[PDB]
Amino acid sequence: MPTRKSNTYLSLVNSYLIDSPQPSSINYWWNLGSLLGLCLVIQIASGVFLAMHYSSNIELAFDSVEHIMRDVNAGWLIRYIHANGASFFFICMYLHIGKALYYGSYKQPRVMLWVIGVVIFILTMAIAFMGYCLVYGQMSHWGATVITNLLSAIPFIGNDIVPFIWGGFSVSNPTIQRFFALHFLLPFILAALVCMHLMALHVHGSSNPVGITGNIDRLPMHPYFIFKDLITVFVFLLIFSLFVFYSPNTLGHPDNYIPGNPMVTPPSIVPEWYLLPFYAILRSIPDKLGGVIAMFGAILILLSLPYTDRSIIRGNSFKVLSKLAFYLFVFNFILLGNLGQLHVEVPYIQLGQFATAYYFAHYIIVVPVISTLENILYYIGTQ
Amino acid sequence: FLSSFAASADVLAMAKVEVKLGAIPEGKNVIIKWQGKPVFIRHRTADEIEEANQVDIKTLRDPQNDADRVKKPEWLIMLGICTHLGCVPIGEAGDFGGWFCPCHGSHYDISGRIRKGPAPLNLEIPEYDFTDDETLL
């Protein structure tokens, strides 16, 4: 047999990259996964080069970041990468979830895969948030403070878990040090989760924009979809350069460049942009315990989605009503993200409550109701 | 092994800033550094403690009461800022003659509530758990 199959290591590399029988009808959206993996490398790569200079002490975290920017040779490049690349990591992850929601990539044969997806999502958010707390700017510190205060709402253990998180009585040196350690670490746990993701993908393969089985026409991957992966990768890197080199702080918040001071809260507290939607949900629910439960449900209800989707046809590409519902859901998610950064004001409190209501109603009402209606409509129309 | 995550000596102790309650005189500023921030406190005077008990919480726009504010009766405290946005606290000035939010000249009551002036919300309490003949924060 060829060396690319006889050797176990090259056999694995072949099974996943060179001969993976990808369907012939996959759009460019299926490239997002590769980008995500690429980003996972970049986050790690630049990340490993920031810890070589980052000092996790609370009195040195911000000064250490500025030392990276000003003193290290390419330190500005490494930091701007590690940050805007996280922003792009979440852009690609949201696009990868949107693709999996539009096309029924979460349906039966791949439910397991979907589950790891969700877990990855959850884990990633933690990592990102934790990493952000390492900068220890104003917004960094106060985001950590708000997060821990909200987690203080667990019924009984809440009063005791928070000191274990803080490592003290407030966000301080132990908190930043443990965040740095767990932030260096959890990316490798996420790499393991990504390996599990790829295994669950390889067991049943990838879906199609048409939804129908691809087994009738499948293509290798080395001459096909590796050179499509290169288009997607180079577009990603071109936009990533337009951000990193030109206007690299657009995605960040200026207040993060003011060193953290517990005695002065900044005018507004917002997470980094990609966590804004969930933050909005958190504020839509008045109760703190209610808010945290509702938020974690907003993330976990993706697990319920494969069972609430009563559609006989995989995917939305051939479904009229479901496409409208999906785009309405996407735009409501963007609206939630927008409301996340806006102050809790007269119209916005009610608008955010309604947006959260519809966000959950999507999964638990609209997807099942619309899917059933469209099944009946398909059968009646053909007859 | 998970006990490492918990407050570390240098934190379990030292973080709780025990200070003698008896030393403070009733009328003056016993301005203290606590929770790594200002921690100003006055052991309550007998007349002042009584005056507060009589004062109606409903009368104040702020929804707070002296009884909830003070854990140990005579001994209590506030963290370091007269106004909701930090205002260095002046002593014995304001609507009730308790403190002046000098940064805006706003009025802080003996209660410490945002009695008047720019404070968006009433002044917070530096770890309010002071007890016995000592304080702690």
Add this chain to the structure above:
Amino acid sequence: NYQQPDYSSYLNNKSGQGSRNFTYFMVGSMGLLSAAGAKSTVEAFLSSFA
């Protein structure tokens, strides 16, 4: 066997060994541009070690 679809419009106008030579040129140019970019990035990162 049968009548093939007419590809006349799809056929290239260029020589048999010439078009593959041009393909070699651009594939190698892509490879060496990527090598130059990787060299720049790796040098920039390792310069932090100094």
Add this chain to the structure above:
Amino acid sequence: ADPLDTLREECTKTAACKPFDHHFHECIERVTKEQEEPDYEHKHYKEDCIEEFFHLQHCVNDCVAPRLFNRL
């Protein structure tokens, strides 16, 4: 004279900026009238011309911005 002040003077005289300057000046007059009454200190809502000033300054900035650094 610095270019910035002359640019503000030119822009505020522009037709687009004229209505904002108008509104701002009668706002100033109205607020001075409100300050004339002896009960001004007791009024809960003591008007101010911050909003009209902001509108005027935004409409003047939208004109000065593109031209100023050609003067320096």
Add this chain to the structure above:
Amino acid sequence: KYTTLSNGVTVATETNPAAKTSSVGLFFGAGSRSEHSHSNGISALTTNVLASQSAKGSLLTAKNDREFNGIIAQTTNDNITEAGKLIASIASNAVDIVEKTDLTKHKQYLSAQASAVEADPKSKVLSHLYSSAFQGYSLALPTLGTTESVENLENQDSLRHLAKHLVNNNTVIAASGNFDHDKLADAIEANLKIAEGVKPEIKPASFLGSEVRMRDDTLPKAYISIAVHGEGLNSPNYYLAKVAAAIYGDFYLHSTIAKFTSPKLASIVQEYNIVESYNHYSKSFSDTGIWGYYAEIADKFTVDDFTHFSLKEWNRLSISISEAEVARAKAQVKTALAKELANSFAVTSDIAEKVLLVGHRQSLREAFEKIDAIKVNDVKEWGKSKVWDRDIVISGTGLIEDLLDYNRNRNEMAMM
């Protein structure tokens, strides 16, 4: 030996006293390559009609090749002259014979043959490979036509075909066996009477790298074929192309010598029994050729492995072929040429093909001398020119799910 009779027709004979049996045949060029889609198969139908005539004790058979057609009357040596006259008659009355013919029965016979070449997996694979390689030109057409086109042929079509192609300038009388050449020539001259006419212009053809996949999952094997633009009968590389093909030679897994055949590919594919059988060939037409291999893979999971290894062994052609392989290929090609030229029927067919399509036939001794002049560097130059990195044409019939699409196999043609 050659003699151009009256009418300008040429009688070419290769007489050998040791010949077991004699043969003489009239060939008039213009096979399927001279047809077009609507009237495809008319040459085969006409030749079958002519060959169905009374044999007067001889054995009258049709040729039906891609580019030339003819009727051959095999017979024992002493009877050869009679057979001569026979075919002459059959060709001097070709138009009459066609006119008086009820093409029904001959058309079911030709349709049965066309179905046969579409059922025998190797015949189907090679016919499809030729069709796709030369797609858009008459050379792509089947030799025997398709079942759809055969049924649509009528007598007037065959008459037009004969009138166009059965002319003195386009016909040759080939013979072999043990007989006096002059006697046969005289016997044919007195009896041959065919219309005058110019040799029809031979239609153009150009190779086009392509892939055709008739995947039938119901078959028990995968019958594939892969080839490059080879060498036509005119090219001086003709024998060089044959030597290159023989370097890789044949292979049948269940044959006893399967474990001992010289070619490296044979040793490579027996490690996991990748392939059941294969055979390398250099098909040569008048001006263009197809040089490649046919293969039957029993294990449907190893088609890709076989294609990969075979194309790698082709890559070896331009770099690492040793003098041992070149000498073996030379000897095997010489032996194959001598085997192909033993039966008098084969010798007659070869004489007709060469004389019609190249005008001159190189004797077997001249062919041996030309092959023995090949060195390893000549073979490697040919590999660089024609095999290394050149477009390939592919064909497959059944269980070809594992036959990776074109780009994989095409890129295998240049990786070291």
Add this chain to the structure above:
Amino acid sequence: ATIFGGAFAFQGFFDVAVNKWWEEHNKAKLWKNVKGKFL
């Protein structure tokens, strides 16, 4: 391999092209061109 060496060709070509276009587009602003006025 030749990849390592060839990468230098393209890297140097683009680097010199940009480091010759940049100090021409910005020659009026760079330090080395302005230092004369303040010396």
Add this chain to the structure above:
Amino acid sequence: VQSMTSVVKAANFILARPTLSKIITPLAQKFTAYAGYREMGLKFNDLLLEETPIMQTAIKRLPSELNYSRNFRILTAHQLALSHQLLPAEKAVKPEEDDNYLIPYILEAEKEAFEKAELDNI
């Protein structure tokens, strides 16, 4: 996922009643025309989620001609999606050719599965 037994149950619940039939069926045809799968050569039953044991059995029990026609239609749909082009109106699948060919086999599969489930809980 919704079973073809339940889908057909609801469809016959609607079709039996003239008011709902008149209101929906025009909307059903309009929805199926706007779905756009017919423009790619696919019949409705080609869209069905194949990756289920019931559905896998249903395809595995199709006749030869229907199986090969389904294979060709699926391949044509894949190619059309691959090349980002649609069949012209004359070549698209007409409403009368969308004949619900696979539904009976899926219904038989679900009947077998439902009887097995019912008898296991006898």
Add this chain to the structure above:
Amino acid sequence: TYMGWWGSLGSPKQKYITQYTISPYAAKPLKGAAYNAVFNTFRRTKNQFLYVAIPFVVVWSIWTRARDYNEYLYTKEGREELERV
């Protein structure tokens, strides 16, 4: 599983389908890139526009109403209504 390797991908018995193709190096690359990227892209956008526009129009109308109301509230004329809320 529902997707085996190349030898057996789980596709049903496939038969009678002939797949023709031409090699690269013998086809016009980017044959209709310029004309297609305009006309076919416009066709695809035309087909898929409404599904993105109707939800977008609804959501952005809601957002515009909320934004305009919020801007109105914080003005010298919106003070009273802001107090009432």
Add this chain to the structure above:
Amino acid sequence: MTAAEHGLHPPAYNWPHNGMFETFDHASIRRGFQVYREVCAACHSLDRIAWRNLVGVSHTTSEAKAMAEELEYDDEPDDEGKPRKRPGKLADYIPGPYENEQAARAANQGAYPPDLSLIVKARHGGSDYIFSLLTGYPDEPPAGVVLPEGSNYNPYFPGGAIAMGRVLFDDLVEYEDGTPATTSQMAKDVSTFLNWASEPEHDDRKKWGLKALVVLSSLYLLSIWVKRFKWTPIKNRKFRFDPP
């Protein structure tokens, strides 16, 4: 929030260094540093900038070194334990006018003039904001607003009240290259210098960005071509289905 609270949004001045391919006007960086030392050093620290950072940007190494000797810094105390001081050197960071935040607040009516080494990346409008702030003071505060004692009205400051008070006045500084010192010119120069101080990599960053865009755009076009070329066989597939 109210328009006053958010602060008037600074406009977009066409700075010489906005476009994707323009550097800082290093003449403006030098002039801005002059204005800084002359005016801003009375109140503002600007700690994260070391004299060495100025060599090759706005000052020749000799000038930066000389400016270093002009100041005193704390050295390791003598072997006898007594405190000792040394003239400044390039490696030393620029010193602020106050020993600690307590001193700064004491000397500025409690207001703490923030360190300017990140004031451009730590404000919404960036450079523009600083400019709009330094020239945003109106001669007459808008009618009706009452400022806390010691505060001056600046619409671009969130809340409308800023403890700074106008500092830049006409001809306050004699520029070294004879440039006129209008208040707008000084404001532009200071904003540019502070933007450099907050983004010393700006010029290098944008040059590297230009090189990266050239490389990646050429490579992306090559990838587009290669993919379309290698997919021509697939997009050109033609099928037939011919059952009996």
Add this chain to the structure above:
Amino acid sequence: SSIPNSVKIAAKESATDLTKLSVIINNAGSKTGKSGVSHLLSKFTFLNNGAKSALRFTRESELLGGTFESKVTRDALILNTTFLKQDLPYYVEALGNVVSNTQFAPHEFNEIVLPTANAETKLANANPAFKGVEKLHEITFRRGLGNPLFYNESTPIKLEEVAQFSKEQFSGENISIVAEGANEEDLTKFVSESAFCYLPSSSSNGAKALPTNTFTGQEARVPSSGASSALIGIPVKPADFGKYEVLSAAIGTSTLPSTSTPLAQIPGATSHLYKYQDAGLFVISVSGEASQVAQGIKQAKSVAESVSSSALSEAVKAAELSVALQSTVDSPLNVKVVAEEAPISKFNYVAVGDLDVLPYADEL
């Protein structure tokens, strides 16, 4: 010619300057040993000699360009070789070391022989016509010439049996070297100095040839999948080889593939006179769809009989042509084709395929 072993040598010039050397072991064919021994022996012939192994002899032969095969025939075991005229001294020597001191190693019996023999048997029997012909020989010549031509697992053979059949056979009187295109004197010298000189004159303890014992009037049926085939077999004395060669060519023979013959007018039909040393079998076969074959075999039967003596005489020249075509180097043929009438009433019948459709002998 001959040598002291009595090994006959025949040599004659050839047309295509290839020395198509061949050795014909007279009675080591499928008739001699127990059913299938000759097949395995033929598979052992060229593998391991006492002089050169398989992987050496095959490689050298391919370098020399020659071809070699071992085919089993009911009369004789034929070792064919084909090589350029320069190559005689090599191959002849090899052939000697093939007849003498062939190794017969068990690892070849299990890896190269039994697998190959089984594959060849399965491939041949997949053809209904060949299965029918084997059955026809079985039921016409019950033993000897009727032994299955190929190894079948129904009659297990152990290596010792094949080795002991190589010995006790291959004797000097039992092998006949035939060459085409090699000087008879040079070939005689090479054979005399080769290993052929060491073979015993005759087998001491085997090769007791049995009488032919032709049986007629029998029939058989062999159910099979796919294509069907009905065959009719006339046993014929050697002296009748002339009559039936004329008959076969008169109606249509496999050696002469041609339309216009009466038997070629019906699909799948053919005829052939298998010729052996002491008997022959004239087989008229039809193959294809069972329904087609049912009528085809009856039509072929009616054609074989009722052939006009005038047309039979006309077919004499075609029969002579067919005999000349068949007389290869390995299978020398000497049959005088006469037009004498040939009866068919004594036919055996065998049916293969859809036995529910194919007729019985009683329907002819």
